Amino acid sequence: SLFLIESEPSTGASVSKNLTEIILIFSNDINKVSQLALTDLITDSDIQGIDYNIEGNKVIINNFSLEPTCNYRLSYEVIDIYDNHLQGYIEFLVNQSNYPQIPDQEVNHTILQAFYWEMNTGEYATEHPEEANLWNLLAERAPELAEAGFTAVWLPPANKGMAGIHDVGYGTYDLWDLGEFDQKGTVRTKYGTKGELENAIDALHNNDIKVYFDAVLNHRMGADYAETVLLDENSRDKPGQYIKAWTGFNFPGRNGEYSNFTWNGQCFDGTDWDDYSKESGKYLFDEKSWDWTYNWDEDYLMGADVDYENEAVQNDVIDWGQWIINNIDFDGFRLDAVKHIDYRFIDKWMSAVQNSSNRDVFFVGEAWVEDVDDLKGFLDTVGNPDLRVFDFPLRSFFVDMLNGAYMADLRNAGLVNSPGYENRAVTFVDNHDTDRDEGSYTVSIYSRKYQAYAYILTRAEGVPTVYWKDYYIWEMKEGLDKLLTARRYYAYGPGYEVDNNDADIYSYVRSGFPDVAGDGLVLMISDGTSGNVAGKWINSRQPDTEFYDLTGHIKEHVTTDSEGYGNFKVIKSEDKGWSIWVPVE
């Protein structure tokens, strides 16, 4: 049977105006091309002078000159070598070639979560061997990351972990060993050596991209030795009993370089394993107490739990964070499990690190709290104005959307919309905990994921994060790149909600800067599935201006009137239910 195997470009693709040919590849060798046309869908003219050439089962069409921003359809009719006839078409959109000129100091900020759980495991290792050396790979990709829009990269924890070469990096062993010493069975971390890391940092900075460290400060695991520890009488398990606790860390492969501090029982409030009885529980150590946290009794999570009331421990961890910034030249931190750590210490440390250099260091805590008011309360409890947090409250709306949400309520969802708190929000759709193969803590955002990135990426407040697994592994890049273009070049000036959202459609306006030509945008996202195009009368804030949809989904333009209003459009489907309308000039 006759049918199109594939094409270049693929249907729905966005291409350069420098594209010279289109190739269609069919299932049988071709005999005739009876009909063929390349149509500009906006002015409805077929381009004259196009040419073609048959090479067995492929057909190559050329001899045209594409216009930036236009939408095109290539129509065909072919007859194969068995006298089968086939009628079809592909369509596409041509990138803009003169984008708005946004001054450096004002370009939007965007972050890449540069990892996922299963990297270099299973079939991931097979299909993506480049990811066996991530530090090397980032140095390599830095230029194209910069071209994509990214201004920062959050790295996985870069220090040695208890699982050695297999530690995704949360099993924290030695913070001062960035893949440089023979510890835990490897010299390198899972991601590469210290050298490679330093090299990656330079490359990234070379292309104007910031580098954040994923600081895991809550616990330690992988002790060099065990000690006999008496448990406090108000311990929840085995009160007043002697246990054998893995609490001795001397880091022998490192031999005192950078810091000669060593760890024992007196550096921890407790642990979750007793090697006499071989039994888990939650074991508080004699005369220790859990540190002050936002919610009651949330200091213990896993591992030997660090005692941040201990001054010698406080002082080493403050030194390390100054080193990461001023010596190894990182630009900021993600704070892991930030709600299980003495909030007095998080403020003290953030402040000591920040005051230590003139660069304006950047801090985002993982405080996994899904109500906005709880999360506000957390940020008020810590009391450090530099602390931003991931917007788990907003992601809860994206989980709602999996089976249908009330789309109008996006006007008020997340920290990113709490007056007084909007710019402390780091917004995101998934991550290594929310989307993982086995053992995941929640359901991933497996449907309407593009609608969700389109929302965070176009928004005037917060700083959005793209998940590596989404961009490179799940095959969403082509789509994501169009939304990164929107953010890089168009998502500027005031934001405006509109007055006609509903159960199924949310729209939003960026007016553009008033002294930059050609910027601004109108977003429409939808949870509709009816399969049809739908319009909304919106004020764009740009009178008498021609707009087009840079997603390529709608093949019309919209010209605003003397007040700025136009009837902008979206497709009601899971799969294409996002459109970003921007100016043609």
Ligand SMILES: OC[C@H]1O[C@@H]2O[C@H]3[C@H](O)[C@@H](O)[C@@H](O[C@H]4[C@H](O)[C@@H](O)[C@@H](O[C@H]5[C@H](O)[C@@H](O)[C@@H](O[C@H]6[C@H](O)[C@@H](O)[C@@H](O[C@H]7[C@H](O)[C@@H](O)[C@@H](O[C@H]1[C@H](O)[C@H]2O)O[C@@H]7CO)O[C@@H]6CO)O[C@@H]5CO)O[C@@H]4CO)O[C@@H]3CO
């Ligand atoms: O297949 C088993 C195991 O394999 C892998 O563990 C590695 C690990 O990655 C290596 O670093 C090394 O471990 C060393 C430590 O570096 C060293 O400090 C010490 O470890 C002690 C721990 O500090 C302490 O927690 C305790 O471990 C208990 C543990 O708390 C219990 O929960 C139970 O372990 C279970 C694991 O939790 C579970 O995930 C799995 O283990 C894997 C692990 O995922 C992987 O990283 O199953 C086990 C239960 O079968 O029991 C243990 C004790 O029985 O005490 C340990 C010392 O006993 O010493 C270890 C070396 O023994 O090597 C391991 C093994 O390959």
Ligand SMILES: OC[C@H]1O[C@H](O[C@H]2[C@H](O)[C@@H](O)[C@@H](O[C@H]3[C@H](O)[C@@H](O)[C@@H](O[C@H]4[C@H](O)[C@@H](O)[C@@H](O)O[C@@H]4CO)O[C@@H]3CO)O[C@@H]2CO)[C@H](O)[C@@H](O)[C@@H]1O
């Ligand atoms: O182009 C089609 C679709 O594009 C987008 O889908 C994306 C998802 O948003 C990504 O998250 C990922 O999907 C993963 C998913 O994350 C992962 O858990 C697993 O899916 C399970 C899922 O957990 C489970 O709840 C159940 O429903 O079955 C699934 C099947 O395994 O694997 C998915 C990958 O297959 O990648 C997809 C595809 O790119 C967009 O969200 C959709 O709107 C669109 O249809």
Ligand SMILES: OC[C@H]1O[C@H](O[C@H]2[C@H](O)[C@@H](O)[C@@H](O[C@H]3[C@H](O)[C@@H](O)[C@@H](O[C@H]4[C@H](O)[C@@H](O)[C@H](O)O[C@@H]4CO)O[C@@H]3CO)O[C@@H]2CO)[C@H](O)[C@@H](O)[C@@H]1O
């Ligand atoms: O040290 C490295 C590990 O920690 C990191 O991620 C973990 C979180 O920091 C930790 O808080 C915990 O998260 C749980 C929440 O504390 C808990 O509240 C719950 O979330 C609720 C939510 O608050 C509620 O409103 C909602 O409706 O339901 C949720 C759960 O049903 O679950 C959270 C997940 O357990 O554990 C985190 C995940 O491991 C690192 O990023 C992680 O990779 C490391 O292992």
Ligand SMILES: [Ca+2]
């Ligand atoms: Ca051309």
Ligand SMILES: [Ca+2]
């Ligand atoms: Ca803790």
Ligand SMILES: [Ca+2]
């Ligand atoms: Ca304590």
Ligand SMILES: [Ca+2]
């Ligand atoms: Ca500073």
Ligand SMILES: [Ca+2]
């Ligand atoms: Ca729902």
Ligand SMILES: [Ca+2]
């Ligand atoms: Ca709806």
Ligand SMILES: [Ca+2]
């Ligand atoms: Ca403007």
Ligand code: NA
């Ligand atoms: Na503690």
